[PDB]
Design a binder for these strands. Sequence first.
RNA 1: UGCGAUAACGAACGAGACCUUAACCUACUAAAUAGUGGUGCUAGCAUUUGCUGGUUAUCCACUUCUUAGAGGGACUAUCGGUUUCAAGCCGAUGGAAGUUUGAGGCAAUAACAGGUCUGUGAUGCCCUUAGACGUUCUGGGCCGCACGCGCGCUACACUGACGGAGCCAGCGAGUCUAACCUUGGCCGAGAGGUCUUGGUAAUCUUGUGAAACUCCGUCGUGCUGGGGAUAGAGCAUUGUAAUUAUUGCUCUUCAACGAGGAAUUCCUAGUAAGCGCAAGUCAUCAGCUUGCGUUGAUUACGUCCCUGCCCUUUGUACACACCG
Lengths: 61, 53, 206, 56, 107, 141, 63, 145, 141, 69, 56
Amino acid sequence: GRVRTKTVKRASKALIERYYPKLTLDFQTNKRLCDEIATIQSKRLRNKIAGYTTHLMKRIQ
Amino acid sequence: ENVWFSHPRRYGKGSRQCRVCSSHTGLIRKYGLNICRQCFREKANDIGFNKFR
Amino acid sequence: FTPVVLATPIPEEVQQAQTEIKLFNKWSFEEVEVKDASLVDYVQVRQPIFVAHTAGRYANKRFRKAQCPIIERLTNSLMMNGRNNGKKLKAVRIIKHTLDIINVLTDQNPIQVVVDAITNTGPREDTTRVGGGGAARRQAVDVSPLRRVNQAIALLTIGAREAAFRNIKTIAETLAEELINAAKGSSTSYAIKKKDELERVAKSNR
Amino acid sequence: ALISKKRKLVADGVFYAELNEFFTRELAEEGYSGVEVRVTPTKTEVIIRATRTQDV
Amino acid sequence: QQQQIIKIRITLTSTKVKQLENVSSNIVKNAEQHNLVKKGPVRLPTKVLKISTRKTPNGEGSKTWETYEMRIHKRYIDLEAPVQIVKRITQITIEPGVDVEVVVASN
Amino acid sequence: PGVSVRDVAAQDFINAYASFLQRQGKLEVPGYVDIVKTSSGNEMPPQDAEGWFYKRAASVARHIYMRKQVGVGKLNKLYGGAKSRGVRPYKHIDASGSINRKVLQALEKIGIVEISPKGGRRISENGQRDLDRIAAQTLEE
Amino acid sequence: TPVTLAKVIKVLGRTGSRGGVTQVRVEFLEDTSRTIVRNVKGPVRENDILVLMESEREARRLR
Amino acid sequence: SLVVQEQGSFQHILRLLNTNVDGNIKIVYALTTIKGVGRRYSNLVCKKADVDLHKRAGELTQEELERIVQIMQNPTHYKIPAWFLNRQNDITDGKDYHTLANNVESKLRDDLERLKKIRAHRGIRHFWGLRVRGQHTKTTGRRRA
Amino acid sequence: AVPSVQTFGKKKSATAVAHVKAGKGLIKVNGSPITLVEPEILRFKVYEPLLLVGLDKFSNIDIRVRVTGGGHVSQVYAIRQAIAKGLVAYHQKYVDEQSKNELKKAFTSYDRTLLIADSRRPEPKKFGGKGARSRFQKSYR
Amino acid sequence: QHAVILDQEKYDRILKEVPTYRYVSVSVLVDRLKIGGSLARIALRHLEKEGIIKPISKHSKQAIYTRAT
Amino acid sequence: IRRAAYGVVRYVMESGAKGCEVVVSGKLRAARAKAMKFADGFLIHSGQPVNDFIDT
RNA sequence: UGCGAUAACGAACGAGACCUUAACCUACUAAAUAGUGGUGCUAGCAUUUGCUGGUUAUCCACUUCUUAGAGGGACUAUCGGUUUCAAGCCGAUGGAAGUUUGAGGCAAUAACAGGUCUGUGAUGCCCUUAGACGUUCUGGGCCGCACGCGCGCUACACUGACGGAGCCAGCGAGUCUAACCUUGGCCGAGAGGUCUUGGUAAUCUUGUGAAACUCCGUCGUGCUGGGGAUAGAGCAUUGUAAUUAUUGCUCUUCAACGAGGAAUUCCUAGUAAGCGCAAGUCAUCAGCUUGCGUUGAUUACGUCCCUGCCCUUUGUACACACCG
Ligand SMILES: [Mg+2]
Ligand SMILES: [Mg+2]
Ligand SMILES: [Mg+2]
Ligand SMILES: [Mg+2]
Ligand SMILES: [Mg+2]
Ligand SMILES: [Mg+2]
Ligand SMILES: [Mg+2]
Ligand SMILES: [Mg+2]
Ligand SMILES: [Mg+2]
Ligand SMILES: [Mg+2]
Ligand SMILES: [Mg+2]
Ligand SMILES: [Mg+2]
Ligand SMILES: [Mg+2]
Ligand SMILES: [Mg+2]
Ligand SMILES: [Mg+2]
């Protein structure tokens, strides 16, 4: 039951839309820069958003 | 005066009552509360007891 | 092989277990080749165990119970009818005495007898209720190997339990008789008898 | 006072509840909004939040 | 009196962990800037006071129960400290919602 | 080669020490043996009945040895059991408070246990020596 | 009766009114490149070898 | 403390206190068939009577049977401590009797008749055939008694 | 000082703290040797870390395992975890890392819970039932 | 139905027929021969003392024996 | 009822709140009772944010 | 829920996110209310150091285990497979954890003539208001039994009963705002009594030495030594009061019950089930409930066949809505 909501997918889409000269195919690097380029209110939501961003970057590649 | 409260109510249901409404049944006396279970649900956030899990 | 001495002296009979891992301390898991094909990777040997108690996870995914060893699944099927829920220590004791009795009668390997009993009372073709009711056709379906080994364990332990109920014979020797008769193929055993009935109804209802 | 801390904190919660309902009943026209009880050493302070503080 | 250490203990009890740790950090900060010797804030197991009452006022319904609960967080600090300037700083700096008690131990 | 009563199995030691205590005959069984059940939750008196006080005393002495101090109430809780209350579900009932107590005076007369200034009974020096000697004999056989 | 050993190549899907039968496709172990679609009662996987008392019968109960 | 073999000098069903005590059953549980003798009383009597507790009640010789009967019938004299008996502080003379085979029906009937004759409520419920120990008669016992 | 590591093992609620120091081959549980652990059929559970790597890996160390919590099977599954983790920690800290890797291979190729605690925890009970999942019986009549 | 006390012919039948029993237990002595469980246990102890049957497990509630040699 | 309820709903709403909701339940000269709602703005109903930002 | 189709595009509540708990952290801050190791100091038994006992301005050091603050961690990571290379799903490896990580708490719009006026000093109206429907007291009743039904407990035993021995939890709670939790000693077969003691509690009850379970014996297929109903006599405790047995204990009486027709409930992994313990109400009384741990399976990882619910299409003379 691992479907991601629109608050994960939309935020991840916006993060790739304005931070492609940034974040890479590594979840830990994406997770660390999601603390600085965005104000995500919880650690679980930050990890979900960074993991979906990583999934979409690996998909874009 | 003669026999008005002549019956001993040192114990049992009729010894104690809710401090809010004086109800002998359904009382909670855990931690010295002496509130009935219907008024405790109303006042339980004022006592400090919160729904967590 | 070489007797090593320690401060707390480990006995020789359990120091002998460094060379080969065997059940309880006696019967090897080597040369317990499963005689019937199509049931390998569903009767689990080739990882030998010491005792038939392994508090592990097998019912979290689908086919993980085929990785539980066959002796442990046989112990686990002995913990039923309610009053024996829990009591894996009792079930492991029953299984240990069972393999003692199968070593005494018919001297060859008790693990081989248990595996032979499983492969001999797995039902090959069962039936199913086709249609939406009891009053309909019954149609024959052949059985998956995992359901074959499952029904084999269930039939052997249910026949053992009912034979051990209300008589002098203990559950270890009634189960040992069930496994011996099923391994040779006897029809004097509950599991072979029930397998014949389940196959025969499917023969008649193809 | 020699009670356990469980019963002491529970009884302070009950005292808060009783004070809060007493001020709810008393200060109805006076725009009551809440009470805070500050237990300092040697005195306790009962602070009433009310809109018509001049009427209080 | 003449800067003789007298071995007090401050017991800090509260149902609110944020303000309780504010008090604990204040006491440890004062005792470290005063160069006091201390056994630090020892945090006791939290008392989870559970009350499982019945959710309904009636009998009617599916039988639903409520676990209201209050947590008691408790800490203590040992201070081998002078008698005057430390009773001053424990007289002052009292947070609401946190109950202090100071006991002198010569055992 | 320094054998204590931890290097001997509990059943083997308690059997050997009970047979030793009965053979040497000093422990002064209380006279209400063979008429007494050993627990309220118990249903029948012990099936040994020529003895069994020596085995209760050996188990108590080994218990006192392996703990620091054990009193009559801890002994009653240890030897008490599930009471078959008939039509009602079972319940833990503490054992006979006279038997464990009289075991404790019986061992204190023969010098196994001691008055233990923090409470119940410790094991005395002589009792520690005795239990270690039967522990060595139980292995070396 | 010469029973035949057949290896599951393709698991087609689950039918039965109750949902308890799986249609699979089996290649015979001896004389392979001979696929028949056959019903299976219990839990069946890929590569699962199973015994058949007929080599000539299909699974006609689907969708 | 060692096991021993044996041989069969045995005799079958035997009469004792007007009760056919059966053979082929160990003596404590053979004496249980006597009314007023249970399992505790049997164990205590076979202990006071110097009876081996293992010997099947037909291996037991008639001198031992006579000692067993004497201890059952006169139990205070053989140091059975009268908290262990039935009719402690009896009803009418204050003695401590243990009541035996045909007499426990007689004393039960005698005390039910005493409770009926006094007109006590327990005697009246005994007369009517209802439950006397304060049970709820609404639901249970709804076939007999 | 003496080379000593301190580890622990866990079943459901049974914690076993092992103290593996350099010694002469000694293995003790809670005061007593590894040959008497009770229960007797689960003695090969606590023998499993001993017989997987060989006893010559244990001939140079003294292990003392203090176990609390749990029950008679959870404590055994904590003993074997404590012993295996203690030997692995000792061969990490003092013996070579390539020796640790062979030991860890021998343990995890046999049973993962020799080194890794079982993560299965008791689910809470909820109202209207007697367990986590099962409910009371409903009637309709 | 079960001879719970031992006469000489049943003793002679035990000492003759427990040899050639492959597996000897309580239930074997209660079924194949006609003594109770009590004499089955006493007989098992006596015959492994005399050395005609050898133990395999010797557990309470399940005693497993085999012929000598 | 509507006048008072809207008069506090918009008073809350332009006192600087994300949202407000007034529910009035009861009867008025009528043998039948109805509950009517008066909402304005953004509200939440589930979660710890109710304990955070919702005042009831 | 999202992908996708697309006269829709972009949003809000609900879901999710959130919070509490459980699981990992030899990484941080520490602790005589937790523990460990040496030993300031000892001390015992067996030996040639194993097992212990005891003192923290009448020792030192440490935090692995324990506790609780702040954090870290998982995001289905990585790699295959598959799907329209889309959301996703499946497998393997790694991992403390890959079932929304397990479990809950909160939980929208619309309703129901659902339950509650007998929870309240919540309440309209009505009734009664001094031979009261107020209040108190005395005694009884709520327990009354030809019977029908529902939730359970105990069972029908040898995978067991009995006895002896072994021996292990976790969630709790507890009195000076008066007698609560009670260790230890002594008496008592037992229930209990009595002299003291610790505890306002990570300190003491309490290592709740729990039960199931394990080992060794007695039984031995017999309604038996399964079962413990009914009933008799006695001893205690609580209480002003125990009779209609409050409950506890001892002896005795030893009933149906030989695994249950038609039917029907609950359940997918530390789960079902077995097992006791604590709390609730409690002066006394748990066969109940809420929780907690102990032991721990079989079977599916699916389908719409039954039942219920939802959605779409269709019909309607229904809209008080088929009880039309
Ligand atoms: Mg006492
Ligand atoms: Mg359960
Ligand atoms: Mg929301
Ligand atoms: Mg939510
Ligand atoms: Mg469209
Ligand atoms: Mg730590
Ligand atoms: Mg209505
Ligand atoms: Mg009421
Ligand atoms: Mg009255
Ligand atoms: Mg009623
Ligand atoms: Mg027992
Ligand atoms: Mg504990
Ligand atoms: Mg009552
Ligand atoms: Mg209670
Ligand atoms: Mg109730």
